[PDB]
Amino acid sequence: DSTECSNLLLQYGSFCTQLNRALTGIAVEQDKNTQEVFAQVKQIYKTPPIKDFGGFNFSQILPDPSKSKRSFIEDLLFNKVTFNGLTVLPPLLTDEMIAQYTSALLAGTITSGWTFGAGAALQIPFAMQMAYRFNGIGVTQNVLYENQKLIANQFNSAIGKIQDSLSSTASALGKLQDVVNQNAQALNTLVKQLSSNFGAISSVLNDILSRLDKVEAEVQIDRLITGRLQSLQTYVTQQLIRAAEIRASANLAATKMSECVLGQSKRVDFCGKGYHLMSFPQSAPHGVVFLHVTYVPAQEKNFTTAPAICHDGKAHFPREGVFVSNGTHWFVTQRNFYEPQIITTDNTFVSGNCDVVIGIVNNTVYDP
Amino acid sequence: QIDRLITGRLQSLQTYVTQQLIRAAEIRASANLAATKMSECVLGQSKRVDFCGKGYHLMSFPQSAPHGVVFLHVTYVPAQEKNFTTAPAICHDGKAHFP
Amino acid sequence: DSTECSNLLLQYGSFCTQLNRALTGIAVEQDKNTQEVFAQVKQIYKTPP
Amino acid sequence: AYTNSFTRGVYYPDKVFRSSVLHSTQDLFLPFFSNVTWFHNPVLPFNDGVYFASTEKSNIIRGWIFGTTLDSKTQSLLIVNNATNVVIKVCEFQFCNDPFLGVNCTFEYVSFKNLREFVFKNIDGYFKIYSKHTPINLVRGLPQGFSALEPLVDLPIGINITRFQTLLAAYYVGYLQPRTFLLKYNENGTITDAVDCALDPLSE
Amino acid sequence: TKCTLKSFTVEKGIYQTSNFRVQPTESIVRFPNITNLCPFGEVFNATRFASVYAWNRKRISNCVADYSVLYNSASFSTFKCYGVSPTKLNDLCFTNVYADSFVIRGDEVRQIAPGQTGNIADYNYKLPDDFTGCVIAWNSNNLDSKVGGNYNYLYRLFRKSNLKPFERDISTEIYQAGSTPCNGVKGFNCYFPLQSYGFQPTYGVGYQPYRVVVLSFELLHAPATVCGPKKSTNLVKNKCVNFNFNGLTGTGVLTESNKKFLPFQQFGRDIADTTDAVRDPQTLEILDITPCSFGGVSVITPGTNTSNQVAVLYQGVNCTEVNVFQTRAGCLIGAEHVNNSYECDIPIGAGICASYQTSQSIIAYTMSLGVENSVAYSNNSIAIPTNFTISVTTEILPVSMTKTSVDCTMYICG
Ligand SMILES: *[C@@H]1O[C@H](CO)[C@@H](O)[C@H](O)[C@H]1NC(C)=O
Ligand SMILES: *[C@@H]1O[C@H](CO)[C@@H](O)[C@H](O)[C@H]1NC(C)=O
Ligand SMILES: *[C@@H]1O[C@H](CO)[C@@H](O)[C@H](O)[C@H]1NC(C)=O
Ligand SMILES: *[C@@H]1O[C@H](CO)[C@@H](O)[C@H](O)[C@H]1NC(C)=O
Ligand SMILES: *[C@@H]1O[C@H](CO)[C@@H](O)[C@H](O)[C@H]1NC(C)=O
Ligand SMILES: *[C@@H]1O[C@H](CO)[C@@H](O)[C@H](O)[C@H]1NC(C)=O
Ligand SMILES: *[C@@H]1O[C@H](CO)[C@@H](O)[C@H](O)[C@H]1NC(C)=O
Ligand SMILES: *[C@@H]1O[C@H](CO)[C@@H](O)[C@H](O)[C@H]1NC(C)=O
Ligand SMILES: *[C@@H]1O[C@H](CO)[C@@H](O)[C@H](O)[C@H]1NC(C)=O
Ligand SMILES: *[C@@H]1O[C@H](CO)[C@@H](O)[C@H](O)[C@H]1NC(C)=O
Ligand SMILES: *[C@@H]1O[C@H](CO)[C@@H](O)[C@H](O)[C@H]1NC(C)=O
Ligand SMILES: *[C@@H]1O[C@H](CO)[C@@H](O)[C@H](O)[C@H]1NC(C)=O
Ligand SMILES: *[C@@H]1O[C@H](CO)[C@@H](O)[C@H](O)[C@H]1NC(C)=O
């Protein structure tokens, strides 16, 4: 706010305006990034008063009405992340609005599965949604219903480990905390550069105007103008490149929102390790957290196997699953869970005589 | 005097080329997305939720536009639902049947 | 390696320090990029004899 | 004779309050763990400036002289405690080559269980004094601990200095270097710890 | 807005046109209590005085020289100054000042000037052509003149050569005034080199005695031990002001504070070097400094082809510092706050948006996220679609920029 300096800054023309235009382009994009992750749901779906989700317990991830109206795990995440012409603008969506979108996405997912992404939300019982998520990974739905208490207890236990993982240490949130740190470090660096001389007699602008007369002071001030303007161009270039890194992360987060919250991804290791069942979005400062629920197969046995079995000269192949021998009998099992079925013309289909197939075995096929 | 003009005009031109390099990377990310939407949505049938527009993807058609591409994503949207009572299995002669 | 030049360069403040910081950030990211591709396997599997 | 200085000899480098914060600064400081000179007086070089410290609960030491000749041909600082308070003069003193006290002029001014520590430095035309007083439990070496020295006076005398001597049982003398230091300011703006950045790779 | 966009038509949006900044209500100056006023009484008011052949010099240093005490003293028979105007003296600073003092007759006071000639000028006290400093005199016939004549005062009548500028020579050696060799004793044309004015009370205005003082100034490598007195104003808290404390010039709002500076500390700094407190030099309170209130000014507008009404957002400002409404984004002016919620038309921030709506005005509202829906969940109800719609969705993606190439030589040096 020196008027002597302002008259010299006008000689540099459009440099000052295009720094404000560049930072405004970044600032508006941060709301576009936040909108396109969370605002994927057209209606604010809300959970019923009852909580009979087949024994699954979402109480740590659904909203807490006693709390902003964040979930328990969203409150952990919001606790663990922590004027020389510079200003900071508010986001377009408050944390209370972001928590209404994660609540709507979660309440839709729980009460209606993949269906609320594709059209109107269609209700389905949670144990039947999980059966259709099990069929999606090639495990036959009776493997859910016959194990529903075990699967519910394993899910409830695994959400319990998320509370401990986020309560006992902050160190998991390093990706979000580093985004706060890089912006604080960049703003402090931009302000610290006001103390630098850039070769001028002093860095204090009124000090130059006391020590020297107009023509000499103008030569000393033009060093401060050159250095401070080069320090803004350095900061705004650095924020343009850092905004491209955050936009690439926001496009990835918008894609995990669409393909894993609103659906069930078939893409290997995209939405957690193991075969993907579903995921739940939880908000965090400057980011999003997905709790990816996945099936991991856990207790293998070795079996002898054959590509086909030869019956009355005909080679039989399994429709779904694979042949295995327990040691002396032969069975067909689904691929991803040991459930042995007796080999029948329902389980198997024919293709030609034995002699074409390398490694075919002689065993009986039952005809009902 | 000319060294002041050369310094200012050269820094004016470096500022433009720096922004064009950053803007070219923003457009490359969109050209790689459009190349992927053409391979997966047009040349195939994507099962990726909301990748090829809202609803279940049937097919899409490319139309050219100046500096871009336009996809007409044809999708199946379910539209007149009715409520039904449901069950995970049914018990017949002492055995559980599943659909 | 001039002593007289270095004491002029200090009067520009954080410009030289943040160039070293920027190139160090690029250097560490090359190790991250190379881990994200190849280090996806949890164990060194070996083929049978 | 010589001694390890430990972490002694930090002072407030400017009249600025800073709090709850770490400040990185370059100034004439005594290096940490420097191997300083020790005495029970000789004329000494002044270099960039001096840290001077004494086991003073005794009134053996009375004052100091600073200049180039320390004799007649040019003006020199004389500093003496008159047993009430410090007196300062800058005369062209022709005084004794072996001065002792019982166990023209262009400027003038008037202000064992203990250590009294002082820093003397000259910049562009001002002579600056910083000091501190503390209890101690050791007779031989400097007390191994930390406490910063506070400014007393900042004198507009314009004199050139290259040598000094004491007027007058242990006391110690060490020379300031243009070190970079990191300074820990507490809630009340006292320096409560410091790091000599050039000391070792962990300090860097 | 039209000027900030450099165009005559403005389309719908929010445009940052300008920056609001509270102006300083007044300018304030603070310095320590004015002390060590220079010892001019020892030269201007002392009972004793010097003979002009052997004048007395007082060295002046380490003090505040209020020259207005001298030049406003209307009792003085003359004031003159050279290289400086009297009203400018109290702004200046010097390494040393010298006050040179003597008694002479009134008719020789006119000799006391740069480069002039006469008995006093050439043989008692010589001033250079480039003398910078002041000449001051007053009649002293009350002290320096006596019945029968005061013969105690003397001036040099004879010398072999003129004095150089500020040369001093008190010697009484007998002077050869002609062909007579002196041989160490007086005689015809071998004379005592001094004479007396003999001041009698019957003397006229030009023969009466005057006490004279000449002030000489210098600036050197040694710092300025003399300055004219520092002014100061009253102190204003809670208003926006421009301020100086000693040499710490700035603009801000001043308040009392909970900060406890150590006794020697004068200023306080924030994490990023920015000054945020000061000690007042006349009563040692610790004042917080905060910047005078400022923020981006944004014009919210419908398209000018639809309406010329506008609303203004003072980003981060609180309205008491500028319909009117305090949003979390800042003071919003010229927009009706509305109790409904709608889809976001023009964004403001912190959940607020604005639009031009119904007879029409700019409204501002908390944006609506979407229609609330209770999914009809129960543990044995399923909804199955009985029918479908084929939907066609248009998606647009940019693929390439306009290809540019610049001749760097022709752009820089046409
Ligand atoms: C769900 O789990 C929490 C503890 O994690 C427990 O307090 C609650 O009673 C459980 N059941 C329901 C229906 O919330
Ligand atoms: C399968 O058999 C091999 C035989 O070498 C053995 O090493 C392996 O541990 C067995 N795996 C299991 C799960 O029993
Ligand atoms: C294999 O399955 C049959 C099923 O009846 C069982 O009797 C037999 O004990 C199993 N084990 C072996 C080693 O064959
Ligand atoms: C496996 O290799 C052995 C090698 O001796 C061979 O006897 C056997 O027929 C092969 N079986 C299949 C299924 O290829
Ligand atoms: C399988 O059965 C056929 C007909 O009985 C026989 O010729 C053949 O040798 C048997 N064994 C194998 C391994 O093909
Ligand atoms: C389904 O049941 C709910 C609750 O009884 C009801 O609100 C809704 O209108 C019903 N019909 C459809 C098509 O959802
Ligand atoms: C300390 O320094 C002196 C020379 O300044 C040297 O004679 C002495 O040996 C040194 N002592 C140690 C322990 O390094
Ligand atoms: C600061 O000074 C106050 C004086 O009352 C004292 O209470 C406090 O303990 C001191 N120390 C700190 C670190 O604030
Ligand atoms: C300054 O002078 C005034 C009036 O004599 C007095 O009230 C005040 O205490 C003085 N302050 C200092 C710091 O000397
Ligand atoms: C202005 O509004 C008129 C309404 O008839 C319309 O014809 C015209 O296209 C509009 N032009 C612009 C620049 O909005
Ligand atoms: C705005 O300023 C007034 C004082 O002018 C203050 O009382 C108020 O708390 C401030 N904040 C808001 C949101 O009004
Ligand atoms: C909105 O309605 C509430 C309750 O009637 C009232 O307190 C508030 O002032 C209203 N605001 C406006 C702008 O109408
Ligand atoms: C299905 O919807 C279409 C309109 O989209 C309607 O014309 C048709 O009659 C409906 N058919 C049934 C079986 O409801």
Author numbering:
A (entry chain C): 745 to 811, 813 to 827, 855 to 1140
B (entry chain B): 992 to 1090
C (entry chain A): 745 to 793
D (entry chain C): 27 to 66, 81 to 143, 165 to 172, 186 to 242, 263 to 298
E (entry chain B): 299 to 620, 641 to 676, 689 to 744
Pull text from the paper.
Changes in the spike (S) glycoprotein in these variants are under scrutiny because the S protein has a central role in engaging the angiotensin-converting enzyme 2 (ACE2) receptor to mediate cellular entry and is a dominant target of neutralizing antibodies (nAbs) elicited by either vaccination or natural infection. The prefusion SARS-CoV-2 S trimer is composed of S1 and S2 subunits separated by a furin cleavage site. The S1 subunit contains the N-terminal domain (NTD), ACE2 receptor binding domain (RBD), and two subdomains (SD1 and SD2). The RBD transitions between a “closed” (“down”) receptor-inaccessible conformation and an “open” (“up”) conformation that allows binding to the ACE2 receptor.
